[PDB]
Design a protein around this ligand. Structure first.
Ligand SMILES: *[C@@H](C)[C@H]1/C(=C/c2[nH]c(/C=C3N=C(/C=C4\NC(=O)C(CC)=C4C)C(C)=C\3CCC(=O)O)c(CCC(=O)O)c2C)NC(=O)[C@@H]1C
Lengths: 161, 49
C-alpha cells in the first residue's frame, strides 16, 4: 500500500533523488494533519458499530432489499452487509490515517466490483449506504476532520461506481 | 294516484318495517351494530412483499 510519507518517498525514488525542500514541506504538512487524523481515527474506531447502525437505519432499513426475497433478507445476508459496511468503514479509516487512498485500491476495490456483480449486490444501494456512513462520520468528527473521511469514502464509492 | 295509477304500498308502520327488515336475512350489517372496519394487520403489511 501507500500513505503520504510513502507517496513522497516513492516520488523521490522514481527519479532516484534525495528529499528536497518540497518533499520535506509535504511531510511537514502530513505531520501537521497527523493530529487530526489520529483524533478522527480513534473516534471512528470507538464508534464504528454505531456509525454502521445509523447508516443502515437511514439508508437501507424498511426497503426492498430487506423485504423477503431482497438481497438483504436471510439474516446471514444481513450480517454479511453489516460485516461489509464495517470493512468499508475500517479501510476508509485506514486511508484517512495514511493520507493516501491506495490501501482502498489494493485491499478493498480489488475484485469488489466483480464480487458484487457476481453476487447480485446492489451497487447503488451500497453507495448510498457509504454516503450515509460519510454523513454520520462527518457529524461525529466535525467538518474538517470529517472532510478527509468523506474524501476516502467518496473514493470508495467512485471506485465502486 | 291520478286517474291512471294503480295504488301501491306507500307507507309502513315501524313494527311492520321491523318484521320485514329485522330477520337474520335482510338485516343490514350497519343497522344497530358497531361496524368495525376490517383491516389487514400492520405486521402482515410490513412482512408482505
Ligand atoms: C419484538 C418482537 C422484538 C424486536 C423486533 C424488531 N425487529 C426490528 C427490525 C428488523 N427485524 C429484522 C429481521 C429479519 N429480517 C430477516 O430477513 C430475518 C429472517 C426471518 C429476520 C429475523 C430486520 C431485517 C429488521 C430491520 C429491517 C426491516 O425491518 O425491514 C425492529 C425495529 C427496529 C428499528 O429500529 O426499526 C424491531 C422492534 N425488537 C425487540 O426489542 C423485541 C425483542
Amino acid at each position: 500500500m501507500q500513505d503520504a510519507i510513502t507517496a513522497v518517498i516513492n516520488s523521490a525514488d522514481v527519479q532516484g533523488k534525495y528529499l528536497d525542500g518540497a518533499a520535506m514541506d509535504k511531510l511537514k504538512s502530513y505531520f501537521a494533519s497527523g493530529e487530526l487524523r489520529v483524533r478522527a481515527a480513534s473516534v471512528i474506531s470507538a464508534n464504528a458499530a454505531t456509525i454502521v447502525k445509523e447508516a443502515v437505519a437511514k439508508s437501507l432499513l424498511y426497503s426492498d432489499v430487506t423485504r423477503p426475497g431482497g438481497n438483504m433478507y436471510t439474516t446471514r445476508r444481513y450480517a454479511a452487509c453489516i460485516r461489509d459496511l464495517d470493512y468499508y468503514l475500517r479501510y476508509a479509516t485506514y486511508a484517512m490515517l495514511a493520507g493516501d487512498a491506495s490501501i482502498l485500491d489494493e485491499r478493498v476495490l480489488n475484485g469488489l466490483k466483480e464480487t458484487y456483480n457476481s453476487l447480485g449486490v446492489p451497487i447503488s444501494s451500497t453507495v448510498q449506504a457509504i454516503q450515509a456512513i460519510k454523513e454520520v462520520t462527518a457529524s461525529l468528527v466535525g467538518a474538517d476532520a470529517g472532510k478527509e473521511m468523506g474524501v476516502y469514502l467518496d473514493y470508495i464509492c467512485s471506485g465502486l461506481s | 294516484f291520478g286517474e291512471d295509477t294503480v295504488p301501491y304500498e306507500r307507507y309502513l308502520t315501524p313494527g311492520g318495517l321491523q318484521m320485514r327488515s329485522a330477520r337474520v336475512g335482510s338485516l343490514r350489517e350497519d343497522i344497530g351494530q358497531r361496524v368495525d372496519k376490517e383491516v389487514t394487520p400492520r405486521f402482515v403489511e410490513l412482512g408482505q412483499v
